[PDB]
């Protein structure tokens, strides 16, 4: 359904959809925040926020274009939403504003204003957004002293060393033709986008990007960011999960869906088909949990992230969640797997084919940057339907059963016991 073609310097990937009323043209680079040091960290975030500058966005809004960017760990995108008949203007803006004439966004008193903006923004993140910085500290300890631990937001003390030379060095090292995929979603045809890229000479640069000397290695550890003036106690907890283009990728997503997510105040999330709720609903152990399967190019995390005000019964919540995790290795039933297949099919169908062509562009650029081709959703649903109970048990015995966990928590986590007592729950004594 989607067409990818490698033109003479650059990779053009389009996903046409003639039912849509917008069209997004962008370029996705394959250097997210895993291509940083711990000292220039946040320079991808500064590049995002100077692509979304006021001086730069006024030029788009006069033409009728919308600017959207996104910073992930592997990739980063710079996508320009427009109307379907106005995509030559999108390519002209993406060419002039961001690729060629790059030294006008990087003027002083635009760099200074944006640096103050993301300093305020990252500090506002670090003081107020507690589940997401707990996932960030989970990455920072699960992958410590390795590329995949650097926060995509950037720290407050590495964003204060940053000058214009650092953004220029990140640009000349990572914004390359062998590193980019120019992406078109919405209702633009594949011949149309590649013709408009062959028409105006669209070249980023010619180099090859710096190879990271160390691959991402999971180190079982914990960080314990306790703060007793906070009302809840947020805690993420995860094992090393499967990377992208693993064979056990969809099995990892399925096993994340076996225990699903939860909201204790939505009365239809109470009635779900998860056996963990029979434990955690009686004394109201938590307010919400959600099991994720984060997959990156090198490694990834499989775990669950939760929040609770029942700060004296954290150990029952952790114990019951992990004794439910052992059931994947030993006694996962069939209807749990069929329920997880139906719900993972619904989740993946809502995720990939939603209404927004920006999110489709980010997903398309990531999947054809890492794999070189985007897997369609029919083949993905065939792969999900191929998963049996023995596949889930074998993946759980490989990845979950008696393996090193990574924990992270802030708030009132005095009720959280130490590492060895929690890691003793990853394997039971066969009862």
Partner 1 sequence: LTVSARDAPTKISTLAVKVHGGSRYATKDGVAHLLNRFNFQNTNTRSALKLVRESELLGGTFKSTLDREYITLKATFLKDDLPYYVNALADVLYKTAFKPHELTESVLPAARYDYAVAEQCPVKSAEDQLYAITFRKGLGNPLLYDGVERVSLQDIKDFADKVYTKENLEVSGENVVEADLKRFVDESLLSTLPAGKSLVSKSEPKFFLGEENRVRFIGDSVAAIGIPVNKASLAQYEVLANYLTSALSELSGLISSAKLDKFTDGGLFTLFVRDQDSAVVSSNIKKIVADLKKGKDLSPAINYTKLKNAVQNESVSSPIELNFDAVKDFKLGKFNYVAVGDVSNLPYLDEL
Partner 2 sequence: AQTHALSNAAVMDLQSRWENMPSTEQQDIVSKLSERQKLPWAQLTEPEKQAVWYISYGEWGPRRPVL
Using CB under 8 A, list all residues that contact partner 2: 37, 39-40, 43, 158, 161-163, 165-166, 169, 173, 210-214
Binding to ligand CDL in span 183-242, by CB under 6 A: none
For the CB of residue 393, give the shortest distance to ligand PEF in the complex, in Å: 20
Q: State which residue, 66 or 428, has the beta carbon closest to partner 1.
A: 66
Distance between CA atoms of residues 354 and 8, nearest Å = 32
Q: How many residues does the chain have?
A: 431
Closest distance of CB 303 from ligand PEF, Å: 19
Q: Can you read off the two tokens belonging to residue 1?
A: 């359904």
Closest CA to 293 of 354, 384, 204, 224: 384
CB-based contacts of 50-59 (< 8 A; 24+ apart in sequence): 50/105, 50/106, 50/110, 50/111, 50/114, 50/167, 51/78, 51/98, 51/105, 53/105, 53/110, 53/114, 55/105, 55/110, 56/97, 56/105, 59/93, 59/97
Smallest separation, CB 417 to ligand PEF (Å) = 12
How many C-beta atoms surround the C-beta of residue 305 within 10 A? 22
Q: Name which of ligand CDL, partner 1, ligand PEF, none residue 273 binds, using a CB cut-off of 5 to 8 Å depending on partner kind.
A: partner 1
User: Is the CB of residue 23 less than 8 Å from the CB of residue 357?
Assistant: yes
Question: Residue 57 touches which of partner 1, ligand CDL, partner 2, none (CB < 5 to 8 A by kind)?
Answer: partner 1
Closest separation between CB of residue 127 and partner 2, Å? Answer: 24
Q: How near is the Cβ of 219 to ligand PEF at its closest, in Å?
A: 20
Instruction: Return the residue of 128, 201, 267, 420 that touches partner 1, per CB under 8 A.
Output: 267
**Distance from C-alpha of 276 to C-alpha of 283, rounded to nearest angstrom:** 13
What is the sign of the dihedral through the CA atoms of 111, 114, 116 and 121?
negative
Among the listed residues 191, 427, 430, 431, the single contact to ligand PEF using CB under 6 A: 427
Closest CB to partner 2 among residues 157, 353 = 157
Binding ligand CDL by CB under 6 A: which of 319, 341, 393, 399? 319
- By the 8 A CB rule, do 181 and 368 touch? yes
In the complex, the smallest distance separating the C-beta of residue 256 from partner 1, rounded to whole angstroms, is 15
Helix then strand count (H, E) for the chain reads 15, 11
Q: Does 403 bind ligand PEF (CB under 6 A)?
A: no
Closest CA to 168 of 113, 228, 110, 106: 106
Could you tell me which stretch among 5-13, 167-175, 360-368, 423-431 binds ligand CDL (CB under 6 A)? 423-431
Residue 225 or residue 343: which is nearer to partner 1 going by CB?
343
State the nearest-atom distance from the C-beta of 95 to partner 2, in Å: 26
Contact mark string toward partner 1, 354..383, x via CB under 8 A: -xx--------------------xx--x--
CA distance 382 to 116: 49
Q: Which residues bind ligand CDL (CB under 6 A)?
A: 319, 428-429, 431
């Amino acid at each position: 359904a989607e067409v990818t073609q490698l033109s003479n310097g650059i990779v053009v990937a389009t996903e046409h959809n003639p039912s849509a009323h917008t069209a997004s043209v962008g370029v996705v680079f394959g250097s997210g925040a895993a291509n940083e040091n711990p000292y220039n960290n946040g320079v991808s975030n500064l590049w995002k926020n100077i692509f979304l500058s006021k001086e730069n966005s006024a030029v788009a809004a006069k033409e009728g274009l919308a600017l959207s960017s996104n910073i992930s760990r592997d990739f980063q995108s710079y996508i320009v939403s427009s109307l379907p008949g106005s995509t030559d203007k999108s390519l002209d803006f993406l060419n002039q504003s961001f690729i060629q004439q790059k030294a006008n966004l990087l003027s002083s008193s635009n760099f200074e204003a944006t640096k103050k903006s993301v300093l305020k923004q990252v500090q506002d993140f670090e003081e107020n957004d507690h589940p997401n910085r707990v996932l960030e500290h989970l990455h920072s300890t699960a992958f410590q002293n390795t590329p995949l631990s650097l926060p995509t937001r950037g720290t407050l003390e590495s964003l204060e060393n940053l000058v214009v030379a650092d953004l220029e060095s990140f640009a000349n090292n990572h914004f390359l033709n062998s590193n980019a995929v120019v992406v078109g979603t919405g209702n633009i045809k594949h011949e149309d986008l590649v013709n408009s890229i062959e028409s105006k000479n669209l070249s980023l640069q010619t180099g090859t990007k710096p190879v990271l000397k160390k691959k991402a290695a999971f180190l079982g550890s914990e960080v314990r960011l306790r703060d007793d003036t906070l009302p809840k106690a947020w805690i993420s907890l995860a094992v090393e999960g499967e990377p992208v283009n693993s064979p056990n990728y969809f099995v990892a997503k399925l096993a994340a869906q076996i225990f699903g997510s939860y909201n204790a105040f939505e009365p239809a999330s109470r009635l779900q088909g998860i056996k963990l709720l029979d434990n955690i609903q009686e004394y109201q152990l938590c307010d919400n949990f959600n099991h994720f399967s984060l997959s990156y190019k090198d490694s990834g995390l499989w775990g669950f992230s939760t929040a609770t005000r029942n700060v004296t019964m954290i150990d029952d919540l952790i114990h019951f969640t992990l004794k439910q995790w052992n059931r994947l290795t030993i006694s996962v039933t069939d209807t749990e797997v069929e329920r997880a297949k139906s719900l993972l099919k619904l989740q993946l169908g809502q995720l990939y084919e939603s209404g927004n062509p920006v999110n489709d562009a980010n997903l398309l650029g990531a999947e054809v940057l890492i794999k070189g081709s985007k897997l369609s959703l029919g083949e993905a649903f065939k792969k999900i339907d191929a998963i049996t109970v023995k596949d889930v048990k074998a993946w759980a015995g490989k990845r979950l059963w008696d393996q090193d966990i990574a924990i992270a928590g802030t708030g009132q986590i005095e009720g959280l016991l130490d590492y060895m007592r929690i890691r003793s729950d990853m394997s039971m004594m066969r009862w």
